[PDB]
Amino acid sequence: EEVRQFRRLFAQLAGDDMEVSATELMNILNKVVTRHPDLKTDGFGIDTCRSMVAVMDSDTTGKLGFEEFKYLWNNIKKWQAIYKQFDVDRSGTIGSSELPGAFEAAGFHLNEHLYSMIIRRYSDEGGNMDFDNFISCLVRLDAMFRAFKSLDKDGTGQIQVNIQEWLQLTMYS
Amino acid sequence: EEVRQFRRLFAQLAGDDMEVSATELMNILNKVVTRHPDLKTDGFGIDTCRSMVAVMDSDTTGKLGFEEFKYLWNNIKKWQAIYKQFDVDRSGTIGSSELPGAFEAAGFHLNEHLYSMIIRRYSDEGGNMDFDNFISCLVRLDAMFRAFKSLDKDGTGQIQVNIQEWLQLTMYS
Ligand SMILES: [Ca+2]
Ligand SMILES: [Ca+2]
Ligand SMILES: [Ca+2]
Ligand SMILES: [Ca+2]
Ligand SMILES: [Ca+2]
Ligand SMILES: [Ca+2]
Ligand SMILES: [Ca+2]
Ligand SMILES: [Ca+2]
């Protein structure tokens, strides 16, 4: 029944081409946040959604098919739950001091240098990250872990990236 | 002469803290576009401006110093001229058949496969790319070429990276 209700909701979200475009994704993400007053956000903008589509578009059709959209949606749900749980002052945002505990609850255990870099690149002047920034960040972080893993065949902790693959991975994202 | 003019322009834009923030950049670019009606754009938004700054921020200050801003600004001017010239139909946007001409004038040679990915990420449903996306795409592309080159100084066409280095290189919105 859980499977059946979700299949139906994808069909309603994707429309006749049975894929979710960046614009489509934007409108449903914004409808979601409207329902959660505990999530502070300046909204999901079109370019952030284009990035999320690209990074999750493994079959390169330009849009999210059922399995791609399922994977992303279920990640957003789990990370939404985490954002709420680690926003302990109820600011609606993930502060610098909340961020490590949240990334780690999402299964991404980094280090001091890498957290600093994330806040520098993703958080605002006050070191705070709102909900669309946190989602955009994790979608990419998850993807980059998955891409390193796909490339690390022999399990050695070191990958070898050619220019073409570099370009593909960084630009279609 | 023109050298002291630009040094003073930087000083004026950077203001009190002597560096250019994502916000200051957003404000000067948006005022730039408003004085070229031939340059179609939905505007330079915070995500795009925070993301240009991040890729240009070589010294991890979170803001653009003189040399960083200069490199960025001079590229933007060069690319703006290319955009106007390669928009041969005067649609005010760079269409899929105009894009390879433009990128070649900018010094970039890419295979069809990578154009198709770039078009899907940065252009609309008709294949037409607006000015802020064009600039955002070129800034990223040049930055990725430079990051790769620095780690491949013998020109093998391949770099070798551990997970820490990989997140540092790729975690750019
Ligand atoms: Ca659709
Ligand atoms: Ca797809
Ligand atoms: Ca908080
Ligand atoms: Ca935001
Ligand atoms: Ca300043
Ligand atoms: Ca800097
Ligand atoms: Ca055109
Ligand atoms: Ca745009």
Domain ranges of chain B: 1-173
Q: Which ligand is nearest to the CA of A124?
A: 4
Q: Do B159 and A172 touch (CB under 8 A)?
A: no
**Experimentally, how was this structure solved?**
X-ray
Q: What is the dihedral of CA B75, B114, A66, A28, to 10 degrees?
A: 20
Question: Quick one: closest CA in A to B138, which residue?
Answer: A171
Topology adopted by domain A1-173: Recoverin; domain 1 (1.10.238)
Q: Smallest Cβ distance to B173: which of A122, A162, A172?
A: A122
Give A77's contacts (C-beta < 8 A, 6+ positions apart): none
Residue B136 CA from chain centroid, whole number: 4
* Other beta carbons less than 10 A from residue B137's beta carbon: 21
* Measured distance CA(A47)–CA(B80) in Å, rounded: 20
Give CB contacts under 8 A, 24+ apart, made by B54-62.
Answer: B54/A120, B54/A121, B54/B172, B54/B173, B55/B139, B55/B140, B55/B143, B55/B172, B56/B139, B56/B143, B57/A120, B60/A117, B60/A120, B61/B19, B62/A120, B62/B21
B120 and chain A in contact, CB less than 8 A: yes
Give contacts of A137 with chain B, Cβ < 8 Å.
171, 173
Torsion sign, CA atoms B100, B103, B104, B109: negative
Question: Quick one: closest CA in A to B52, which residue?
Answer: A121
- A63 marked among binding-site residues: yes
Instruction: Output the six-digit token pair for B25.
Output: 């950049």
Residue A115: is it exposed, middle or buried by C-beta count within 10 angstroms (0-12/13-18/19+)? middle
Residue B164 CA from chain centroid, whole number: 25
Q: Give the Å distance between the CA of A21 and the centre of ligand 1.
A: 5
Closest CA to B147 of B123, B168, B173: B168
B154 and chain A in contact, CB less than 8 A: no
Question: Quick one: closest CA in A to B139, which residue?
Answer: A171
Instruction: Output the six-digit token pair for B46.
Output: 């915070």
Instruction: Output the six-digit token pair for A162.
Output: 């050619």
Euclidean distance between the first and the last CA atom of chain A, given in angstroms as a whole number: 34
Q: Do B168 and A122 touch (CB under 8 A)?
A: no
Give A43's contacts (C-beta < 8 A, 6+ positions apart): A30, A33, A132
* Measured distance CA(B89)–CA(B94) in Å, rounded: 9
Instruction: Output the six-digit token pair for B89.
Output: 């139909």
Coil, helix or strand at residue B30? helix
Q: Give the Å distance between the CA of B97 and the centre of ligand 4.
A: 34
Q: Give the Å distance between the CA of B63 and the centre of ligand 5.
A: 8
Q: Give the Å distance between the CA of A5 and the centre of ligand 4.
A: 30
Closest CA to A72 of A20, A31, A119: A20
